[PDB]
Amino acid sequence: TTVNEALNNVRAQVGSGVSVGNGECYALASWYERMISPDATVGLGAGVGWVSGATGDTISAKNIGSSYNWQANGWTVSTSGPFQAGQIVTLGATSGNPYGHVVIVEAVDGDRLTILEQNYGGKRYPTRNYYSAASYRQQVVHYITPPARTYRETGTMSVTVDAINIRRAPNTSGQIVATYKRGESFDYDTVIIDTNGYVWVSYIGSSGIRNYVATGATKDGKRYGDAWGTFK
């Protein structure tokens, strides 16, 4: 899995309205890191930090750059930019939240940052927001720069999000064939569980080609957030 592929996976969370992991800002970053460094034994994604760097056995987003051993896994940390696609970025504390914030940089276009984040404005699900880099950099603490189980199952999925893309491959740049909308139901014959990625369901489509539908995030082989529909 490349940075681009992990990033594409986070992009595909946008619009789901469904929390990754426990809904905190750092759950999105943790999932993202895990996709890039799936075999790390220390770090945020691995759930092992310096006990000295935290208080009350709680995770504090503003301290994520100093509470976890990022360079153990080949990541680099800086207090200076510039912003780059693929970075994890931590932000200082403000009125209301003593723990600050953490996000993922999706893209940079001139002064425009495209930011992927969870639980920014009470919205405890992944969203895409735009910011001015000249403004945003003033709140940055750290810039953190990066370096499937399959089985048969005959089931029916009922979709409980606005829409899910249908794809020709089980990855998030497999280009859209169509979508399934909220409430709609469809049959599948195969389940694919990314160790760190998505639970996919799959079937052979009308034109004889196998199709794949993502149904929610996975981390370390288990669902990491609510499913995007119900199953029976």
Q: What is the spatial distance between Cα 144 and Cα 81, in angstroms, rounded to a whole number? A: 10
Residue 12 binds to Na ion (criterion: CB under 5 A): yes
Under rule CB under 5 A, which residues in 200-219 are in contact with Na ion? 214
Residue 165 binds which entry of Na ion, Cl ion, none, CB below 5-8 Å type-dependent: Na ion
Number of residues lying near Na ion (CB under 5 A): 9
Would you state the structure tokens that stand for residue 215, as one six-digit string?
A: 């149904």
Q: Which residue is nearest to Na ion (CB)?
A: 39
39 binds, among Cl ion, Na ion, none (CB under 5 to 8 A by kind): Na ion
Residues 138-177, interacting with Na ion (CB under 5 A): 165, 168-169, 174-175
Distance, in Å, from the CA atom of 224 to the CA atom of 204, rounded to the nearest integer, reads 27
Residue 219 near residue 11, CB atoms below 8 Å: no
* Subset of 18-57 contacting Na ion (CB under 5 A): 37, 39
Residue with smaller CB distance to Cl ion, 92 or 147 = 92
Q: Does 93 bind Cl ion (CB under 5 A)?
A: yes
The encoded tokens of residue 168 equal 């020709």
Rule CB under 5 A: choose which of 54, 165, 205, 227 binds Cl ion: 205
Q: Which two tokens stand for residue 216?
A: 């929610």
Residues in contact with 168: Cβ distance below 8 Å, sequence separation at least 6, in sequence order: 174, 175, 177, 209, 210, 211, 212
| Binder among 196, 211, 215, 218 for Cl ion (CB under 5 A) | 211
CA distances from 148 to 168, 212, 218 (A): 17, 14, 11
Least distance in angstroms from the C-beta of 117 to Cl ion: 17
Q: At what angle do helices 25-36 and 3-11 cross, to 10 degrees?
A: 150
3-class SS of residue 168 = coil
- Provide the greatest CA pair distance for the chain: 58
Residue 78: beta bridge partners? 143
Q: Which is nearer to Cl ion, 80 or 110 (CB)?
A: 80
| 74 binds Cl ion, rule: CB under 5 A | no
Told to check if 51 binds Cl ion by CB under 5 A, we report: yes
Tokens, residue 55 = 């208080």
Using CB under 5 A, list all residues that contact Cl ion: 42, 50-52, 62, 69, 92-93, 166, 205, 209-211
Using CB under 5 A, list all residues that contact Na ion: 12, 37, 39, 165, 168-169, 174-175, 214
